[PDB]
């Protein structure tokens, strides 16, 4: 139902090893479609989805000229933050930025995003009203007053309320076969004996899109959320995702444990058990 | 589509 477009940016300075490295990626929901790496021969914005290759050369020239300008601005900001935090010029530091917009089934904006981070910690972020900022410390307050004087929020508000939602809906129509149709998971339960009196049941979910899924084990109607080992949802490598959950079950009582999976591509939540 | 804006720190 809900859809989103996101752009991620990462800049890490390499003092003595050359220019700072800049890598940016774009996502429509959980699907990568554009990328740009500063450490390539003649770096240019490259496509990563079939439905984005339909854009004209003027589109690619703009996106390349935007990513190369963002890399230049990060070099100025990385040197500026050294003055703000009294840091040394011989240390490697990291600048991160993400901006994007969420839209609902109506096709209108629900939530806007724009935030920066220095060395893994928050720096300055755009509030949800798309008109104010929240600074993390007094150094970010220096940037906050400059961004308020230059009326930076007004351009972002116009972009997030306008071109972000409009071009996301364009992408959702051009990639209507892959982005608007969800792939349900393929479920099964495996059995792995640990000892004579203890065993483990593993509930699998393979090949599902998007990444949002919930795997919960249940002891006769009550969840074993404390005794359940869950792993981070991992990408399979073909734009699909995988997740599994496991429980330590006393041997002989395997039929009192049930796995419950919920996903958008599923018609109704699933209930699956170990079939011998 | 990316945003066209320059806003240095």
């Amino acid at each position, epitope marked *: 139902g809900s859809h989103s477009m996101r752009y991620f940016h990462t800049s890490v300075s390499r003092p003595g090893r050359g220019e700072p490295r800049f890598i940016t990626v774009g996502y429509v929901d959980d699907t990568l479609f554009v990328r740009f790496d500063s450490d390539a021969a003649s770096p240019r914005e490259e496509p990563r989805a079939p439905w984005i290759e339909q854009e004209g050369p003027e589109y690619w*020239d703009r996106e390349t000229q935007i990513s190369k300008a963002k890399a230049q601005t990060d070099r100025e900001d990385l040197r500026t933050l050294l003055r703000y935090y009294n840091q040394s010029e011989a240390g490697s530091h990291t600048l991160q930025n993400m901006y994007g917009c969420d839209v609902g089934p109506d096709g209108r904006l629900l939530r806007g995003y724009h935030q920066d981070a220095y060395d893994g910690k928050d720096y300055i972020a755009l509030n949800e009203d798309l008109s104010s900022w929240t600074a993390a410390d007094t150094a970010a307050q220096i940037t906050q007053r400059k961004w308020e004087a*230059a*009326r*930076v929020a*007004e*351009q972002l508000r*116009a972009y997030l309320e306008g071109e972000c939602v409009e071009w996301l809906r364009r992408y959702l129509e051009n990639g209507k076969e892959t982005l608007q149709r969800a792939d349900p998971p393929k479920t099964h339960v495996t059995h792995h004996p640990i000892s004579d009196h203890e065993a483990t049941l593993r509930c699998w979910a393979l090949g599902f899109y998007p990444a949002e899924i919930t795997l919960t084990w249940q002891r006769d109607g009550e969840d074993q959320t404390q005794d359940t080992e869950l792993v981070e949802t991992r990408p399979a490598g073909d734009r699909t995702f995988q997740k599994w959950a496991a429980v330590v079950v006393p041997s002989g009582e395997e039929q009192r444990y049930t796995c419950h999976v919920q996903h958008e591509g599923l018609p109704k939540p699933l209930t699956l058990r170990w079939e011998p | 589509l990316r945003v*066209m*804006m*320059l806003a240095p720190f």
Partner: T-cell receptor, first 110, second 112 residues
């Protein structure tokens, strides 16, 4: 390549009449678009700055639109006063540099 | 924004120097040339003492931004076509969401 054109060249209109000044540009990848008034002496003074993704801006009797897709901007002046008589320049900011239009001279006849 | 000089009458082959003082607190300076045949043309932009953007500035035009954020413009081997209005602009920085503030302008007339 960016080329900014402004029509008409000159304009003499009675005071109180609403005006429509047009601006066209060929390169849509712009950071913003401004409208300047040039009076002999002081020089260029900014009137409206339309952000890249903004479609309209307003300030008093001035109301300007922006459509980057078509490559068109339009400044609407409401209830023309004799003080508004000046040359009006359409400016645009691109990746490499800034481009200005030919200009539109305005004479608000009292 | 202040500029110097105000007016400037000279002959072909001579050399002039135009200086500009931006607003206090502004780190970027812009030079423009307004001629009858080409209109307002962007020359060069300096930001915090370093060159940032450049237009179709001739090789015989020399400019520089000093550490006090003031700017200089040398027009050498003057020709009749160099007769134009030379404006100086300044901005707080390189923000695409902010405007420029122009100065009064220096009028140059080059005679044979």
């Amino acid at each position: 390549k960016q080329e900014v054109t402004q029509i008409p060249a000159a304009l003499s209109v009675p005071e109180g009449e609403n005006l429509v000044l047009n601006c066209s540009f060929t390169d849509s990848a712009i950071y913003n678009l401004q409208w300047f008034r040039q009076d002999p002496g002081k020089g260029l003074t900014s009137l409206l700055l339309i952000q890249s993704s903004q479609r309209e801006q307003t300030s008093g009797r001035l109301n300007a639109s922006l459509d980057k897709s078509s490559g068109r901007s339009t400044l609407y002046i409401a209830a023309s006063q004799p003080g508004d008589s000046a040359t009006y320049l359409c400016a645009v900011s691109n990746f490499n540099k800034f481009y200005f239009g030919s200009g539109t001279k305005l004479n608000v006849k009292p | 924004v202040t500029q110097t000089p105000k007016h400037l009458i000279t002959a072909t082959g001579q050399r002039v120097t135009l200086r500009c003082s931006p607003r206090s607190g502004d780190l970027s300076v812009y030079w423009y040339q307004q001629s009858l045949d080409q209109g307002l043309q962007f020359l060069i932009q300096y930001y915090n003492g370093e060159e940032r953007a450049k237009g179709n500035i001739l090789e015989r035009f020399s400019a520089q931004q000093f550490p006090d954020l003031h700017s200089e413009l040398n027009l050498s081997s003057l020709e009749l076509g160099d007769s134009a209005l030379y404006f100086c602009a300044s901005s707080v920085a390189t923000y695409s969401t902010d405007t420029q503030y122009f100065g009064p302008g220096t009028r140059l007339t080059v005679l044979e």
